Amino acid sequence: TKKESFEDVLPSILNTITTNSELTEVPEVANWLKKVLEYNLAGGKKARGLTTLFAYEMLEKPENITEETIYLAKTLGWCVEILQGFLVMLDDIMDGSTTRRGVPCWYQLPEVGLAAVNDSSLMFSSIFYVLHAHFADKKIYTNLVELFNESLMHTSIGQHLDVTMERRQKSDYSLFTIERYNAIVKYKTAYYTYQLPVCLGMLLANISDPVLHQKAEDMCLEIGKFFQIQDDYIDCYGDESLTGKMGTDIQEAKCSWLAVMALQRCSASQKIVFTTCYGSKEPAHIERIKELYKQLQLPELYAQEETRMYESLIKQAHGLPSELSPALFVRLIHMIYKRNH
Amino acid sequence: KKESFEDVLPSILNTITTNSELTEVPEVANWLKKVLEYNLAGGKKARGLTTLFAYEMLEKPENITEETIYLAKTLGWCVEILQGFLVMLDDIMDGSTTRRGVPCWYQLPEVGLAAVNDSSLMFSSIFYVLHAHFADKKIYTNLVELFNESLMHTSIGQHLDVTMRQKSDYSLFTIERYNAIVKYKTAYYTYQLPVCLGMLLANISDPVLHQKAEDMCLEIGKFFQIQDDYIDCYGDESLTGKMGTDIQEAKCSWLAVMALQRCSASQKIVFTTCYGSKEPAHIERIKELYKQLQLPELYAQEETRMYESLIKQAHGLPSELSPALFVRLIHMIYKRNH
Ligand SMILES: CCC[n+]1ccccc1CC(P(=O)(O)O)P(=O)(O)O
Ligand SMILES: CCC[n+]1ccccc1CC(P(=O)(O)O)P(=O)(O)O
Ligand SMILES: [Mg+2]
Ligand SMILES: [Mg+2]
Ligand SMILES: [Mg+2]
Ligand SMILES: [Mg+2]
Ligand SMILES: [Mg+2]
Ligand SMILES: [Mg+2]
């Protein structure tokens, strides 16, 4: 399977990180970073790294694909996985999270705490040593480095929208609109989750035409909105033993798809219940919100919107130039439709 | 000079917005502007100025133009933005309260731990500035790499700095550990980076000259961090802009390493009893010990011996690395009190 094949290269990636940096001189640190990386990359689906490799394989002419290019595609994919692990290490701090991939969040470990913020920088900086080690002498080098820095800017833009204390004042949820939601998810998720791995695949396949990149980017951004709606749903409704994480969107007062849809449907008296109980860690409050979501039929709306968006994404995919592989995108869509984690 | 450096700031802030996706999201562009202004305000701009001075003294006067001076300042501001980023995070890890005479960014009620996201916004900004001014230039990739390398070096050092003595075991508080901490956490980004950037802008690529420069820079940087450690304990907050935390955070400071060198058996038990505690009486008790051990006197003497050694080294550099630049840099910091 593609997953074990992708995972097979991880130990070699970790050595590359060391050997190509000053880490060679400070083994206390090189050994620590190994622990950081193994913990924060462990488990999960590897979906972003896979999407990188799948894109490359689907977009390149099969006659131009070599074992070396496959290793390079996996390497780019692992760089997205590292970015992911960095992003979620900080996100977990910001979101008051307790567990991820079925264990304590990195920052919750007693030996780590707030020094996680330095572990994050060590992870992020690893990326550029991988990129330099494999690509410095190639024409795509500066496209790669810029793409990963752009991804950091995009994601942080979206994270600011997400966590900003200005998103709500007390009982004022006037900013919980779809305009705000669309901005949040476009920036915090859609870019790094889809646009980045696909663009990386494209660059590796020597596709440079700005029109094709723009077309692929618009497709990606649509898929990533869809993907975050599913993330938000799962926060509320997912099975912890499958997702590996306790949901916190309700207690943290997030402008999640569910909150936005709930406000679409609240009666005047329901709106008061929402504003009273949303954003609180008391279990009775949290439960009251979930009951309200149920009364408002948000589970049925999700199922129907997931399908409508699904059908819309598939049609968009079929209308892409063949140079972008409609089939790749159809398959990416198919892989996440109906997911429960 | 400083104000001629500071005049360039409005164009940097403008570039950061317009060169990015920030143009579509004015809520975030306005926030980033506040983040930058607050975290770059005041201070000495020392690292930015080193960059500028390094270029001006390394390049032949016949090659310096108004446009290359602007580029040198721009690169200096990139270093200032890196500094801002690094200390934003450091202040979280060190439990600091103030910096530059105001609350540390993370202490602000509306920021908190979301400061970690503001740090990413700052770090990422650097690369838009480098792209705007340098993308079509040969040195571009070298500049991008130098910044990413600075992040790795600093984080390596920060790791050694923050990593969790055991209890009353201060066996690891040695000069070997100190030397590694400060080489990586300070000396690289504070001196090697700005000087390397000046060298690149002056088209100086000879690896031997880069090596000699680096070696000088690493010596200066250790020195600078010793002074920083001393200031944490003895500096006047109305000048430094910051409340000291090394004692209460149990840091492997120069002072602590030197204290251990001198402690009698009973002094050692006092040190292990009182170091690393937020209790005011415990902190003052460490300070009373430092005084008893004549650490202020030792610092004054060691600052002078290291200064003399630094100057001797600078005078012995190749002509093409500007002994005078280094003499100048060392004189700007010797005897500093913030
Ligand atoms: C699906 C990617 C979502 N995402 C984007 C940016 C940063 C972090 C995450 C992780 C998500 P999660 O994994 O549920 O904690 P979020 O906190 O709900 O947005
Ligand atoms: C002189 C640069 C010292 N430095 C290096 C790396 C990261 C942060 C700092 C800031 C220092 P400070 O300004 O005293 O908090 P440190 O925490 O004593 O080291
Ligand atoms: Mg989260
Ligand atoms: Mg989040
Ligand atoms: Mg979520
Ligand atoms: Mg500090
Ligand atoms: Mg520190
Ligand atoms: Mg200090």
CB under 8 Å to B257, separation ≥6 — which residues?
Answer: B173, B174, B175, B178
Residue nearest to atom 17 of ligand 1 (CA): A91
Place of tokens 């200066």: B220
Distance CA B236, CA B244 (A): 10
Distance CA B187, CA A36 (A): 25
Please indicate whether residue A100 is annotated as part of the active site: yes
Instruction: Measure in Å the smallest separation between the Cα of B109 and chain A Cα atoms.
Output: 9
Neighbours of A200 (CB within 10 A): 27
List, as one string, the DSSP characters of A61-86: -GGG--HHHHHHHHHHHHHHHHHHHH
Cα angle A103, A104, A110; round to 5: 140
Closest CA to B301 of B215, B230, B225, B222: B230
**Chain breaks of chain B after residues with C–N above 2.5 Å:** 164
Q: Which of A114, A142, A146, A252 to mutate to test the interface with B (most CBs of B within 10 A)?
A: A114
Give start and end residues of each alpha helix (H) in chain A: 2-7, 10-19, 27-41, 47-59, 67-94, 116-135, 141-163, 178-185, 196-204, 210-237, 240-243, 257-265, 268-277, 283-295, 298-318, 326-336
A103 CB burial (10 A radius; 0-12, 13-18, 19+): middle
Distance CA B15, CA B128 (A): 8
Lookup: tokens for B226:
């010793």
Place of tokens 């004189």: B331
Closest CA to B184 of A127, A123, A25, A126: A25
Q: Give the side-chain half-sphere CA count within 13 A for A327.
A: 7
* Position A45, amino acid: K
Q: Give the side-chain half-sphere CA count within 13 A for A141.
A: 18
Q: Which of A118, A159, A164 sits opposite B158 (nearest CB)?
A: A118
User: Would you put residue B108 in left (φ > 0), alpha (ψ -120 to 50) or beta?
Assistant: beta
* CA of residue B301 relative to chain centroid, distance: 23
Using DSSP's 3-state secondary structure scheme, residue B81 falls into helix
Helix (H) or strand (E) holding B102, with range, is strand B102-103
* Position B63, amino acid: N
Lookup: tokens for B166:
């055991």
CA distances from residue B10 to B74, B120, B133 in whole angstroms, order as listed = 11, 21, 15
Give chain B's radius of gyration (CA, Å): 21
List, as one string, the DSSP characters of B87-98: HHHHHHHHT--E
Structural domain count, chain A: 1
Please indicate whether residue A218 is annotated as part of the active site: no
CA distances from residue A196 to A68, A131, A142, A277 in whole angstroms, order as listed = 21, 14, 15, 38
Mutation to probe ligand 2, out of B90, B105, B239 (largest number of atoms < 8 A from CB): B90
Strand A103-104 versus strand A99-100 pairing type: antiparallel
CA distances from residue A249 to A92, A192, A280, A290, B221 in whole angstroms, order as listed = 12, 21, 10, 11, 45
Closest CA to B29 of B149, B108, B128, B96: B128
Distance CA A9, CA A254 (A): 37
The widest CA-to-CA distance across chain B, in whole angstroms, is 65
Sign of CA dihedral A174, A178, A184, A187: negative
* Position A92, amino acid: D
Place of tokens 């984690």: A341
* DSSP secondary structure letter of residue A170: T
User: What is the extent of the structural domain holding A257?
Assistant: 1-341
* Position A71, amino acid: Y
Asked whether the beta carbons of A163 and A251 are under 8 A apart, the reply is no
Asked whether the beta carbons of A230 and A257 are under 8 A apart, the reply is no
Neighbours of A72 (CB within 10 A): 17
Contacts of A96 in chain B (CB under 8 A): none
Place of tokens 């980023």: B85
Q: What are phi and psi of B120, to 5 degrees?
A: -65, -40
CA distances from residue B224 to A107, A122, B24, B152, B326 in whole angstroms, order as listed = 31, 24, 42, 20, 13
Long-range contacts of A282-289 (CB under 8 A, 24+ apart): A286/A250, A286/A251, A289/A250
Q: Bridge-partner residues for A100, per DSSP?
A: A103
Q: Quick one: resolution in A?
A: 2.0
Q: What is the CATH number of the domain that holds B223?
A: 1.10.600.10
Q: Bridge-partner residues for A172, per DSSP?
A: A169
Size of interface A-B (CB pairs under 8 A): 132
Closest CA to B72 of B158, B134, B163, B135: B134
A21 touches chain B (CB under 8 A): yes
Lookup: tokens for A48:
């972003």
Distance CA B338, CA B72 (A): 25
Give start and end residues of each alpha helix (H) in chain B: 2-6, 9-18, 26-40, 46-58, 66-94, 115-134, 140-162, 175-182, 193-201, 207-234, 237-240, 254-262, 265-274, 280-292, 295-315, 323-333
Asked whether the beta carbons of A46 and A10 are under 8 A apart, the reply is no
Write out residues 80-109 of B within 8 Å (CB-CB) of A: 89, 92-93, 109
Is residue B94 lining ligand 2, measured as CB closer than 6 Å?
yes
Asked whether the beta carbons of B88 and B118 are under 8 A apart, the reply is yes
